[PDB]
Amino acid sequence: MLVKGNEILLKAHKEGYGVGAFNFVNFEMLNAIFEAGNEENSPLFIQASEGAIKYMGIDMAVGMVKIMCERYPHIPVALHLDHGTTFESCEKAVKAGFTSVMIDASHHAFEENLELTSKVVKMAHNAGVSVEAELGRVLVNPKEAEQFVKESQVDYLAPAIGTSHGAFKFKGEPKLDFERLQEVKRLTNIPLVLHGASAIPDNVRKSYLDAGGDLKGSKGVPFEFLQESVKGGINKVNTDTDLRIAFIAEVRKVANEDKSQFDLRKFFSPAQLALKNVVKERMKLLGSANKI
Amino acid sequence: MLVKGNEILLKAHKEGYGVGAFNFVNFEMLNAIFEAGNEENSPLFIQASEGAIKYMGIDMAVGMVKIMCERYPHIPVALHLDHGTTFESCEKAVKAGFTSVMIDASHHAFEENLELTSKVVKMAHNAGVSVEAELGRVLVNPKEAEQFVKESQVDYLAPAIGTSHGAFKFKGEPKLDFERLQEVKRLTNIPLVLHGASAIPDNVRKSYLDAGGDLKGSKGVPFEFLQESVKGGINKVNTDTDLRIAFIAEVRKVANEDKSQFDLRKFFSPAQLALKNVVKERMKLLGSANKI
Numbered sequence: 001m002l003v004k005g006n007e008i009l010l011k012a013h014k015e016g017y018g019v020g021a022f023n024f025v026n027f028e029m030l031n032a033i034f035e036a037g038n039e040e041n042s043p044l045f046i047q048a049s050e051g052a053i054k055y056m057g058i059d060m061a062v063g064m065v066k067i068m069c070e071r072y073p074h075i076p077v078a079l080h081l082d083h084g085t086t087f088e089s090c091e092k093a094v095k096a097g098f099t100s101v102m103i104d105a106s107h108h109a110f111e112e113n114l115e116l117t118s119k120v121v122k123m124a125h126n127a128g129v130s131v132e133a134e135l136g137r138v139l140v141n142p143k144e145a146e147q148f149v150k151e152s153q154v155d156y157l158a159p160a161i162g163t164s165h166g167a168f169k170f171k172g173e174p175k176l177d178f179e180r181l182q183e184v185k186r187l188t189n190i191p192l193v194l195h196g197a198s199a200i201p202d203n204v205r206k207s208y209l210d211a212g213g214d215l216k217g218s219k220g221v222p223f224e225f226l227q228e229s230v231k232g233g234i235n236k237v238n239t240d241t242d243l244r245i246a247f248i249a250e251v252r253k254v255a256n257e258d259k260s261q262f263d264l265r266k267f268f269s270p271a272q273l274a275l276k277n278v279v280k281e282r283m284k285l286l287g288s289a290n291k292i
Numbered sequence: 293m294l295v296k297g298n299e300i301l302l303k304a305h306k307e308g309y310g311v312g313a314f315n316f317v318n319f320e321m322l323n324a325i326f327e328a329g330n331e332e333n334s335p336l337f338i339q340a341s342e343g344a345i346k347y348m349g350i351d352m353a354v355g356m357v358k359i360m361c362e363r364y365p366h367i368p369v370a371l372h373l374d375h376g377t378t379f380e381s382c383e384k385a386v387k388a389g390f391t392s393v394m395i396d397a398s399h400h401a402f403e404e405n406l407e408l409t410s411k412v413v414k415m416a417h418n419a420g421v422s423v424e425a426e427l428g429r430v431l432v433n434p435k436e437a438e439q440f441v442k443e444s445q446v447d448y449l450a451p452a453i454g455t456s457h458g459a460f461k462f463k464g465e466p467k468l469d470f471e472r473l474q475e476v477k478r479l480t481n482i483p484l485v486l487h488g489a490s491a492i493p494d495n496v497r498k499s500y501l502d503a504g505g506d507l508k509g510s511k512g513v514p515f516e517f518l519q520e521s522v523k524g525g526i527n528k529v530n531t532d533t534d535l536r537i538a539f540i541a542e543v544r545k546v547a548n549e550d551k552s553q554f555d556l557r558k559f560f561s562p563a564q565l566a567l568k569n570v571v572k573e574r575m576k577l578l579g580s581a582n583k584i
């Protein structure tokens with residue numbers, strides 16, 4: 001059932017596992033994410049970026065998730081606004097029925113970030129909705145994180161410890177500041193969020209290139225860094241790129257191998273399966289499998 | 293809003309125009325169809341095959357359409373089960389919120405076709421749902437059609453007048469029996485349905501071939517035959533193949549021109565536009581534009 005984001009992440013926080021936060025932009029992605037959670041007996045964070053919401057319509061985004069929740073009413077599900085850019089955007093998500101909203105003001109100075117975050121928190125908490133904020137761009141200041149969390153009363157925090165959104169994360173070898181993660185965790189004692197957490201698994205890379213795609217030397221967060229992140233206190237692991245590559249790899253493959261194929265189901269049933277499997281493996285990696 | 297299929301088709305019947313019946317299998321197809329209906333001020337018949345319902349789940353098929361209707365509440369919309377093959381399938385569609393159901397028993401002899409159709413009609417009319425049936429494979433016997441409609445109470449009839457499904461309709465020159473259509477129309481005085489009515493326009497074919505697609509010498513119903521069909525009494529024009537070809541053309545196109553592209557919206561926003569334009573033009577051709 002559809003629940004406050006903090007309901008899910010407080011449990012992950014206390015028990016020391018990570019919950020994948022999986023972006024979707026249409027029915028096929030959403031269906032595959034839900035089937036993965038059902039098969040791995042794992043809670044789900046479902047997130048939609050502002051762009052995904054513009055594409056679907058916020059009414060469709062919420063509506064499709066509510067249908068999927070009724071289909072799998074035993075799975076805890078949070079519906080999360082990913083990288084909300086304005087108070088008004090977070091407010092619209094709250095009104096539409098999102099159960100978690102992220103406000104990204106990390107590009108502002110501390111005082112302005114804190115002020116905007118606090119305003120979102122007041123609004124969202126009055127409506128029973130949980131709030132994520134971000135600190136750091138470059139890396140988080142743990143004492144700043146400590147005061148930020150206490151002052152804003154935000155539910156979870158994304159501290160910058162060395163990740164970038166999308167492919168092409170690291171200018172070489174993957175590096176994450178785990179001692180800084182541990183300090184943030186110690187001082188804030190709340191669920192923490194990792195952005196830019198796609199790993200680009202080798203099998204997903206191989207299916208994408210074998211289908212003719214070009215990943216342009218992208219580097220994901222290695223699996224061991226994700227596991228060490230969770231050990232350091234990460235409880236929400238934002239995952240988008242991995243899903244998109246796996247999905248479009250299969251779409252490209254169908255197009256290549258049958259130039260007369262125009263039944264959408266023939267493109268998107270294998271795409272769903274590939275996406276579903278990435279999610280299932282990620283739920284096992286992060287420790288959310290069998291936590292229902 | 294969401295209305296009984298007969299509400300839309302009775303108006304078309306009485307005023308002598310055709311309403312396109314457009315199949316969907318996911319959100320992108322449904323969104324494009326609805327934007328077309330909104331931009332051409334046209335009533336909408338939205339169709340889901342049994343395969344599409346299995347792919348989406350009938351709860352999602354109905355759910356997404358209801359969301360779309362609330363987004364465009366000035367548009368009359370019927371949600372129609374396309375080629376229901378059993379009573380139980382039609383009954384499940386009625387229970388899920390479909391407003392029109394088609395039972396295809398045209399492969400049975402007249403007596404068994406009529407018996408199953410009448411059983412579906414009694415169930416669906418008790419629930420306020422309209423019913424379509426089919427006669428002919430062999431082209432329709434107009435005198436059978438007259439008795440069939442009188443005895444079954446079915447709301448609209450698909451008579452076989454020379455069309456098959458999907459691509460590869462005519463292995464030569466297009467040809468439809470308009471004399472037999474006019475007779476069926478005169479004897480039944482109900483809305484009539486044309487199955488296998490995709491035209492495969494030249495521009496859609498070209499886009500698909502331009503993107504490396506292979507249409508294997510497929511040929512559709514020419515626009516002038518579709519217009520002569522509506523002149524003869526066709527009021528519902530089943531359209532599916534044209535939508536898929538135009539959609540997948542743009543998908544293949546995006547895959548070909550950028551091997552690093554894996555943002556789903558970059559594949560499906562141009563796909564939606566190409567599908568919307570096919571639908572808009574078809575609505576103009578059939579005479580449903582500006583009938584809202």
Ligand code: NA
Pocket residue numbers: 047081082083102132238
């Ligand atoms: Na987020």
Ligand code: NA
Pocket residue numbers: 373374375394424530
């Ligand atoms: Na039909």
Ligand SMILES: [Zn+2]
Pocket residue numbers: 083165195196238
């Ligand atoms: Zn992010």
Ligand SMILES: [Zn+2]
Pocket residue numbers: 104134158195
């Ligand atoms: Zn971020």
Ligand SMILES: [Zn+2]
Pocket residue numbers: 375457487488530
């Ligand atoms: Zn048909």
Ligand SMILES: [Zn+2]
Pocket residue numbers: 396426450487
């Ligand atoms: Zn048929």
